[PDB]
Structures are given as structure tokens and as C-alpha cells.
Design a protein around this nucleic acid. Structure first.
Length: 117
RNA sequence: ACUGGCAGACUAGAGUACUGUAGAGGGGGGUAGAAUUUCAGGUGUAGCGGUGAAAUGCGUAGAGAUCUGAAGGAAUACCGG
């Protein structure tokens, strides 16, 4: 382990799962945790609370590297946007900046077809 | 008288010249930025993805995530009504 104190939390909140990848500021991965690896499956992955746990699990694995300050980059529309960020505050970590990093095409590729469900 | 013909006349219709104005009008060429995919390398480690739920699929040969770069094609967020 290289001990780092300043880092970046990259919350990837899909509508299905939520991934949390705490990195150094140079974007090398240190820890990751996912709603659908932190216990919850099918329906319950896609809940705030599953993502919270992902964040918690990742947080208490990020302390091995001795991280202290994180910037949160919240990327996507999922339920695990807000909850993960709370779970980083309420796990010690000082949050410096909360960026949104959602990829927005400036008209680009034709999305998949509409679901005639 | 009215319609037509013929020979004139007229400027209200129609058109011309002049100067501006707005405009995703058209055709050609170039270029920008965002994003997707693929690929290469770094970090990293067990999931990812998907759904009503799931399975097919993808992943330990290292995925997904994340960083950087590259290469392509297509379409031009906001403005925007």
C-alpha cells in the first residue's frame, strides 16, 4: 500500500446497479464496491440503500490506503446518487468537491429503440 | 350597350432597375466539441450486464469501474421557440 490522503470517489449510478470506485487523484483504482456485490440482488440492487452499503464497504476498504479527503464524481441517473455521497460523509471522509460526471452527448449516437412493453 | 377583331391610348394588374433587411432555402468544401464503440497501456478485483423476476451474454485468459491515449463513423446538447 502507498498511503494516500487526497482521493476521488467515482459513483456510477446506473438504473440497475451502483458502483463506487475510490481512486487516487490520478484515477488509479484503490477500492471498489457495488450494490450487486454488497449483498443485494435483482430488485434491491436498484435501491438507494444497496448503493449506500457499496459506498460503506468501499469506504472501510479505502482506509487501508489511509484516505481522508475525497472529491465525489457522481455519474448517472440511478437511485444510488445521493445515498452513496451521504455514506462517504458519514464514514469520516471529508468531501471537498461533489462533481457530476454524467456523459451527455451533444447529439451523437442513436439511442436504443423505445421499449414497447 | 356588352363580348370579339383591328388601330391607337392608359397605369391600378404583372414585371424591371436601385438600396437595404431577416432567414436550419439550396449546392460544394473545411473544421470543432460532447458522446458511443473498438483498441493499447496504467490502476484495480470480483463481478458486470440485464429484468417484473430471470436467463442468454460478458468476466479470473482480469471483466465491469477508473485514468490516459489512439482510431473510426455518425449526429450536432444548450440556443430552440
Amino acid at each position: 500500500r502507498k498511503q494516500v490522503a487526497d482521493g476521488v470517489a467515482h459513483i456510477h449510478a446506473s438504473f440497475n446497479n451502483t458502483i463506487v470506485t475510490i481512486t487516487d487523484r490520478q484515477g488509479n483504482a484503490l477500492a471498489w464496491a457495488t450494490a450487486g456485490g454488497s449483498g443485494f440482488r435483482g430488485s434491491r440492487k436498484s435501491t438507494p440503500f444497496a448503493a449506500q452499503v457499496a459506498a460503506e464497504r468501499c469506504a472501510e476498504m479505502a482506509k487501508e490506503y489511509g484516505l481522508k479527503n475525497l472529491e465525489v464524481m457522481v455519474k448517472g441517473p440511478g437511485p444510488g446518487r445521493e445515498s452513496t455521497v451521504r455514506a462517504l460523509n458519514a464514514a469520516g471522509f471529508r468531501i471537498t468537491n461533489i462533481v457530476d460526471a454524467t456523459p451527455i452527448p451533444h447529439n451523437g449516437c442513436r439511442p436504443p429503440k423505445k421499449r414497447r412493453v
